[PDB]
Write a protein that binds this ligand. Structure first.
Ligand SMILES: Nc1ncnc2c1ncn2[C@@H]1O[C@H](COP(=O)(O)OP(=O)(O)NP(=O)(O)O)[C@@H](O)[C@H]1O
Ligand SMILES: [K+]
Ligand SMILES: [K+]
Ligand SMILES: [K+]
Ligand SMILES: [K+]
Ligand SMILES: [K+]
Ligand SMILES: [K+]
Ligand SMILES: [K+]
Ligand SMILES: [K+]
Ligand SMILES: [K+]
Ligand SMILES: [Mg+2]
Length: 429
C-alpha cells in the first residue's frame, strides 16, 4: 500500500551517513506519521524513539523525553545547574544509543534540546553536540507548536531568540537537514489542497475565504444527530456536548485496568468509559485486520460485558473487544538496545465522539466535520481543523471563516525561508 516518494527516498538517502541529523516535516496529511513508523522499522539495533508527551510516546512505541533524560519540569537555562544524576544502567544504555528519533519535535521548547545536549555530553564525556548521537526529528511547526506560559518566556528570553526547537543553542554547534513531505494523501481536490497550503503559511488571500464561505450552514452546524463530528477549541465545550448527548438514561460504565507502571498522563483511553446504545463513538486504535483505524466513527448498537458492537459510518459493523496498550522502557541485552514492558492498560478502544477538541483531532482524518469557529484562535488551530477533512464537501462551519482566524507566526515563516536558502539545512555545517 505504501508509496515511497522522492522526498521519502531523500530522507533515507541522507541518513545512510550517520553524521546527518534530519528534521522531517510535511503538509497536513502527507505521511509524516506513516513514514516515521517506516523509518523506525528500518532503524537498526541501537536506536531509541522518544516523544515529548506520554500519549505521543505510547503511540510511537517509545518513551518520554522527560523519563529518558530526567528532564525537570519548567524552563531550564544554560546556566541552571544540572545535577540530575543518572543510574549506572541508564548511563550504560545511553552510551549504546547511536540514533535518537524524536516524534512531535514541534512541541519541544528549545531549552529541552539543550538540556538533552548537555546531558549526553556529560554521559559521553565529550564536547561533541548530543555526545555525537545522530538525531532524527519529526514534527509540524505549523500544526503542533509548543504552548508556553509568560513566566516561561520571560526566563528563556535572556538566552533564546525564540521559543521553537530550532532556537536551541546546540544548533550553533551542529545542524540538520530538512525534508518537507509535499505529496498530500488525505485531500485529493487541488483547489482544497491549494487553500490549505496557503492557510498553513498565512499566505492566504481574503479572496479564498469566499470559497470557504459556502461551508457555513446554520442548520447542519447546530445539529448533533448527523454523522458529523463537532470540532471545538476548548475541552470544556467538547465535554458538555458529549455529556449532553450521552444523557443519563441506560448508561453502561466500563472501567480501565492498569497493570504496574503506566503514568496516567500516558494513558490514551478513557479511565471510565460511559456509553449507551445510540452513542457516537470514535476508535482509538489502528487494526487493519479487524477493519478499523484510529479516528474511525460509528454508532453503538449493542453493549455487553466484553464486547461493544458499533456500526461504523462506512457501513461495517465491528465487535470491539478490550485492547491492551503497552508501556515500555529501553534496556540493554548484550550491546543492543531492546524494549521491555514495564506496565500496561486495558480498555475498549472507543471514546465518545459527537465532539472533539482541535488538540485531540491532531493527526486524525474525518469525512464530515463541523468547525465551531472562534475569534480567539491560536496559530495553526483553524488549519488543523480544516485539514482533518478529506473533502471540502464534508466541511461545515457555524459562522464564516475569516482572515482574523489565521494568526501568523512570522518566526516560522522566517525559519522556512532560512533553511531553504541554505540548501535545506539549518544550523552549523
Ligand atoms: N507513503 C504513503 N503512501 C500512501 N499513502 C500514504 C502514505 N503515507 C500516508 N498515507 C496515507 O495518508 C494518510 C495520512 O497519513 P499520516 O501518516 O497520518 O500523515 P501525517 O502527515 O502524519 N498527517 P497529519 O499529522 O494530520 O499532518 C494515511 O492514513 C494513509 O492513508
Ligand atoms: K500506506
Ligand atoms: K516527492
Ligand atoms: K529509499
Ligand atoms: K556521530
Ligand atoms: K514544520
Ligand atoms: K538556533
Ligand atoms: K504557502
Ligand atoms: K470551543
Ligand atoms: K463489563
Ligand atoms: Mg501525524
Amino acid at each position: 500500500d505504501m508509496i515511497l516518494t522522492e522526498e521519502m527516498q531523500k530522507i533515507m538517502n541522507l541518513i545512510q551517513d550517520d553524521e546527518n541529523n534530519v528534521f522531517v516535516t510535511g503538509k497536513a496529511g502527507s505521511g509524516k506519521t506513516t513514514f516515521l513508523k517506516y523509518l523506525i522499522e528500518k532503524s537498526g539495533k541501537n536506536c531509541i524513539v522518544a516523544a515529548p508527551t506520554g500519549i505521543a510516546a505510547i503511540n510511537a512505541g517509545g518513551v518520554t523525553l522527560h523519563s529518558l533524560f530526567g528532564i525537570p519540569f519548567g524552563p531550564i537555562t544554560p546556566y541552571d545547574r544540572l545535577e540530575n544524576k543518572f543510574s549506572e544502567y541508564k548511563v550504560e544504555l545511553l552510551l549504546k544509543m547511536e540514533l535518537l528519533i524524536i516524534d512531535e519535535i514541534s512541541m519541544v521548547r528549545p531549552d529541552i534540546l539543550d538540556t538533552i545536549d548537555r546531558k549526553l555530553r556529560w554521559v559521553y564525556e565529550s564536547d561533541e553536540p548530543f555526545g555525537g548521537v545522530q538525531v532524527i526529528m519529526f514534527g509540524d511547526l505549523f500544526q503542533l507548536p509548543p504552548v508556553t506560559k509568560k513566566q516561561e518566556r520571560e526566563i528563556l528570553s535572556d538566552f533564546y531568540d525564540g521559543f521553537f526547537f530550532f532556537n536551541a543553542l546546540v544548533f550553533k554547534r551542529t545542524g540538520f537537514h530538512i525534508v518537507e513531505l509535499t505529496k498530500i494523501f488525505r485531500q485529493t481536490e487541488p483547489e482544497f489542497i491549494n487553500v490549505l497550503n496557503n492557510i498553513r503559511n498565512y499566505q492566504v488571500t481574503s479572496d479564498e475565504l469566499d470559497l470557504l464561505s459556502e461551508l457555513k450552514d446554520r442548520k447542519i452546524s447546530s445539529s448533533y444527530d448527523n454523522e458529523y463530528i463537532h470540532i471545538c477549541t476548548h475541552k470544556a465545550d467538547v465535554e458538555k456536548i458529549n455529556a449532553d448527548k450521552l444523557g443519563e438514561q441506560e448508561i453502561r460504565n466500563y472501567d480501565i485496568v492498569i497493570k504496574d507502571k503506566f503514568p496516567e498522563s500516558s494513558i490514551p483511553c478513557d479511565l471510565h468509559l460511559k456509553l449507551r446504545v445510540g452513542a457516537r463513538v470514535m476508535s482509538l486504535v489502528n487494526d487493519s485486520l479487524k477493519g478499523y483505524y484510529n479516528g474511525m466513527l460509528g454508532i453503538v448498537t449493542a453493549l455487553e460485558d466484553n464486547v461493544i458492537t458499533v456500526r461504523m459510518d462506512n457501513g461495517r459493523t465491528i465487535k470491539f473487544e478490550r485492547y491492551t496498550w503497552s508501556n515500555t522502557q529501553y534496556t540493554l541485552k548484550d550491546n543492543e538496545i531492546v524494549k521491555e514492558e514495564i506496565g500496561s492498560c486495558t480498555q475498549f478502544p472507543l471514546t465518545l465522539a459527537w465532539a472533539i477538541t482541535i488538540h485531540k483531532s491532531q493527526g486524525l482524518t474525518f469525512d464530515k466535520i463541523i468547525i465551531h469557529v472562534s475569534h480567539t484562535f491560536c496559530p495553526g488551530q483553524l488549519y488543523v481543523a480544516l485539514s482533518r477533512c478529506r473533502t471540502l464537501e464534508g466541511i461545515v462551519s457555524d459562522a464564516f471563516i475569516t482572515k482574523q482566524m489565521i494568526i501568523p507566526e512570522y518566526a516560522l515563516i522566517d525559519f522556512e525561508r532560512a533553511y531553504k536558502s541554505e540548501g535545506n539545512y539549518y544550523g552549523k555545517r
